[PDB]
UniProtKB/Swiss-Prot annotation, chains A, B:
Quaternary structure note: Homotetramer or heterotetramer of pore-forming glutamate receptor subunits. Tetramers may be formed by the dimerization of dimers. May interact with MPP4. Forms a ternary complex with GRIP1 and CSPG4. Interacts with ATAD1 in an ATP-dependent manner. ATAD1-catalyzed ATP hydrolysis disrupts binding to ATAD1 and to GRIP1 and leads to AMPAR complex disassembly. Interacts with GRIP2. Interacts with GRIP1. Interacts with NSF via its C-terminus. Interacts with CACNG2, PICK1 and GRIP2. Interacts with GRIA1 and SYNDIG1. Part of a complex containing GRIA2, NSF and NAPA and/or NAPB.
Entry superkingdom: Eukaryota
This protein's name: Glutamate receptor 2
Tissue-wise expression: Detected in forebrain. Detected in dendrites of neuronal cells. Expressed in the pyramidal cell layers of CA1 and CA3 and in the granule cell layer of the dentate gyrus.
UniProt source species: Rattus norvegicus (Rat)
Localization terms from the record: Cell membrane; Postsynaptic cell membrane; Postsynaptic density membrane
Function: Ionotropic glutamate receptor that functions as a ligand-gated cation channel, gated by L-glutamate and glutamatergic agonists such as alpha-amino-3-hydroxy-5-methyl-4-isoxazolepropionic acid (AMPA), quisqualic acid, and kainic acid. L-glutamate acts as an excitatory neurotransmitter at many synapses in the central nervous system and plays an important role in fast excitatory synaptic transmission.
Note: The postsynaptic actions of L-glutamate are mediated by a variety of receptors that are named according to their selective agonists. This receptor binds AMPA (quisqualate) > L-glutamate > kainate.
Induction comment from the UniProt entry of this chain: Down-regulated in the pyramidal cell layer of CA1 in the hippocampus by global ischemia.
Lineage summary: Eukaryota, Metazoa, Chordata, Craniata, Vertebrata
Length: 25, 25
């Protein structure tokens, strides 16, 4: 139950931080 | 107590490494 939550949130924050890095770049 | 310290520090080092990567790019 919590595993998919952690996974989805992890993917979410991953794409977000990568996008931030790219934009700043 | 320590949870928000780890969180804030994580956010901090996150912004810093993203900024470094972007700048170097």
């Amino acid at each position: 139950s919590a595993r998919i939550v952690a996974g989805v949130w992890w993917f979410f924050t991953l794409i977000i931080i990568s996008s931030y890095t790219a934009n700043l770049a």
